[PDB]
Design an enzyme around this catalytic site. Sequence first.
Site, PDB file in Angstrom:
ATOM      1  N   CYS A  36      34.014 141.650  48.087  1.00 26.60           N
ATOM      2  CA  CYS A  36      33.833 142.455  49.302  1.00 26.60           C
ATOM      3  C   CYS A  36      34.483 143.864  49.079  1.00 26.60           C
ATOM      4  CB  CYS A  36      34.486 141.692  50.470  1.00 26.60           C
ATOM      5  SG  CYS A  36      34.404 142.668  51.975  1.00 26.60           S
ATOM      6  N   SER A  88      38.132 147.587  57.974  1.00 22.53           N
ATOM      7  CA  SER A  88      39.015 148.143  56.909  1.00 22.53           C
ATOM      8  C   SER A  88      39.384 149.615  57.161  1.00 22.53           C
ATOM      9  CB  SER A  88      38.363 148.019  55.528  1.00 22.53           C
ATOM     10  OG  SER A  88      37.152 148.722  55.585  1.00 22.53           O
TER      11      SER A  88
END
EC number: 2.5.1.18
Length: 211
Positions: A19, A73
């Site tokens: 990822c 994120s």
Amino acid sequence: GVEVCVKAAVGHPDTLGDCPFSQRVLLTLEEKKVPYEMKLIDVQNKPDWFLKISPEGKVPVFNGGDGKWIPDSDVITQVIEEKYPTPSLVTPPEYASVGSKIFSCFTTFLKSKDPNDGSEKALLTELQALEEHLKAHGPFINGQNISAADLSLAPKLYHLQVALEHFKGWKIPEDLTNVHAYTEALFSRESFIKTKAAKEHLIAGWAPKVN
Ligand code: NA
């Protein structure tokens, strides 16, 4: 101290997966020298403890030692920045969008089965913009010191390079010499080597999407 949940490799729950959003978080913690515990999540077999702290099944999630787990994120690297300000990874707002269309252009071109649909040209346009930026302002996006934008971009360029070579035999043109200098610098960092997916796992993660 801090804890982060990231994706495990497909087929290999014990191994770090691919990822790019997860890797951005990990890279940030590594570059800041922040100790952390990493929890690998098999996203095709999530644990119930995980579902209790991430009810939508979102990965990555981050716990900064303040009694909660947060997703996204972008948001996570900003919280890390605020809590661990040195080394500074602040990217100047004028350069925040540098490289921002490269990943999606890559995914469109990767999935393309039509050589004349322009997806390739669209990707080259975004690579060329990165090249022009690095020629004016490099060696990193903000000049001599690494910053948040590099740690966002590097996992994405890694997918681009590995997947496009594997599935389409396509490489970033050699005349884009600043982009090649840039990827070679970033991917050779110990933080990057420590946090990247093995290429066979990254490829296995894209194979059903290409497909
Ligand atoms: Na599941």
